[PDB]
Amino acid sequence: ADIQQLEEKVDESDVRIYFNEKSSGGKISIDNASYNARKLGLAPSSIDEKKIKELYGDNLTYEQYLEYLSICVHDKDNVEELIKMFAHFDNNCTGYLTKSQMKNILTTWGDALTDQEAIDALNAFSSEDNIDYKLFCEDILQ
């Protein structure tokens, strides 16, 4: 995604308003840029954050913030890759993982969530201890 594509997917008015909400001295921190990206429905990972940081440092001008948002687009995202990641841990091929198991996965590798973030993400999907991870991934991409 370049900025032109980005501004067909998100509303530029929101992009600007959210920048104004968080900016200081005409610039926005990467943490606040990621917060804005999420509000706009985008899903940055640490890969995207480290990329923009290498280019511009941790405090972005408006145009650099636009370039960051374009990096956050991720058109190739899909449910299948997520299900397959969880299915890796589903040895008995039940289609289920417990909340404890999913919490472990989410808080151990990659851009690890805190225990509370993981608990809150899981409890929000289901009151029950056994999670149909296929249904969970469909819901997370909703």
Binding site: M85, D120, I140
Partner: peptide, 18 residues
């Protein structure tokens, strides 16, 4: 293993919680 896909999942969880 499968780290890229895990990062995408964690990214969507952070998105949804925002």
């Amino acid at each position: 293993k499968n780290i890229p896909s895990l990062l995408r999942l964690q990214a969507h969880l952070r998105k949804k919680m925002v």
